[PDB]
Structure formats: C-alpha cells, structure tokens
C-alpha cells in the first residue's frame, strides 16, 4: 503492497532497534483506545485525542514535563494486547480536540508478556489491567517499554492496513449520503 504506508514507512523510524527503554526521566501514560479505527487514524495523521477528562490530565503532565519526554502505551478496549507506543509532541488544542503524537512503536504485545507487573499507584492492578490515561510509575514504565521493545512480534495493525483505509473511505462515502439525504 500500500502506498500510503509505504510514504508513513518512510517518513517515520518505527520498531527501532536501538530505543532507550532506560529513562532518565519521563512520564509514561496507559492510552486505552476505543477501537482499531482510531489507532489507525492516529498512526497516519500523527495526532491523537482522548475523552475531555484524558485530554486536561494529559494536556496537563505534557505541559509539567517541558525535563523529559511524555509516552504513551496504546491498547485497543478488549484487544488483549497493546499495539504500540507514541511520545506526546504537542499540549491539547481544542473529536473534539488533538495533540500530536509520534509513534515510534507499531507492533501487537500480548497482555501475558505484560500482566506480572503491577501498577502500586492503582491498587496493585496489573498494568495490563488500567484505565485510559493512567500514569505508570517510571521504574514500571522502564520495564513495560523494555518489554515491548525487546518483544519479536508475529503482528501489527500494519498487516490491517488496507482493511482500514478501505473501512475510513466507505464510510465517508456512507455519512456524505446520509448528510445529503439530511439535507
């Protein structure tokens, strides 16, 4: 093959070799996402928008941190598996809103590579266990992007790539028809 991915290929470094798992310092965030659309949507526009509590939470810790990068780990609702990582690149501007992201991880985890380590700051709960825009403690998020890192993956939403841009532009076909016949 697609061309599209082919020029996103290109134009980004994903599933590098070397990535500094070891932070120096950083705050690291659960991104739990309500469907694959919006992962895809996300990789190929290089934005990415949560609820508005998510959104003042993130815009927030983006803004405390001007000292150190802010990542974001992406789950799709239900999946069983993470899907990748995104640094943060731009506080929210007012889906309803946006930032910027830059993904640098594209590739499915299964949650039991990540399950036995526990969040202290959500009552012990696994990580794989969170809530959207829970923070992960650094020394855990050390571990969790070491694991993804390290983590030789069978698939990723890459594999899906055709089968989404052809979801995203039926579906605009099929809101145009319907805001004409609306109107």
Same mark, same amino acid.
């Given at each position: ?5 082919e020029?996103l &290929?290109?134009?980004h ?5 070397e990535?500094?798992?070891?932070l120096?310092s950083?705050?690291?965030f659960? *991104?739990?996402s309500?469907?694959?659309?919006d *992962?895809h949507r996300?990789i &190929?526009?290089? *934005? ?5 509590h ?5 815009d927030?810790?983006f803004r405390c941190?001007s000292?150190g ?5 992406f789950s799709?609702?239900?999946?069983g598996?993470?899907?990748g ?7 929210v501007?007012?889906?309803?809103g946006k930032?910027?992201?830059q993904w640098i991880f594209?590739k499915?985890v299964?949650?039991?590579?990540l399950?036995?380590?526990r ?7 696994p990580?794989?266990?969170s809530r959207?825009?829970q923070?992960?403690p650094?020394?855990?998020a050390?571990?969790?992007?070491? *694991?993804i890192?390290s ?6 939403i890459?594999?899906d790539?055709?089968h989404y841009?052809k979801?995203q532009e ?5 809101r145009?028809?319907r805001?004409s016949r609306?109107?």
């Amino acid at each position: 093959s697609h061309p599209v991915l082919e020029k996103l &290929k290109a134009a980004h470094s994903y599933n590098p070799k070397e990535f500094e798992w070891n932070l120096k310092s950083g705050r690291v965030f659960i *991104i739990k996402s309500y469907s694959e659309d919006d *992962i895809h949507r996300s990789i &190929k526009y290089s *934005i990415w928008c949560s609820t508005e509590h998510g959104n003042k939470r993130l815009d927030s810790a983006f803004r405390c941190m001007s000292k150190g990068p802010v990542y974001l780990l992406f789950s799709v609702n239900g999946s069983g598996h993470f899907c990748g990582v995104a640094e943060m690149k731009s506080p929210v501007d007012y889906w309803k809103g946006k930032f910027d992201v830059q993904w640098i991880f594209v590739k499915d985890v299964p949650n039991n590579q990540l399950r036995h380590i526990r969040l202290e700051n959500n009552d012990n709960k696994p990580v794989t266990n969170s809530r959207d825009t829970q923070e992960v403690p650094l020394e855990k998020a050390k571990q969790v992007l070491k *694991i993804i890192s390290s983590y030789k993956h069978t698939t990723s939403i890459f594999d899906d790539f055709a089968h989404y841009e052809k979801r995203q532009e039926e579906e605009e076909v099929v809101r145009k028809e319907r805001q004409s016949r609306n109107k």
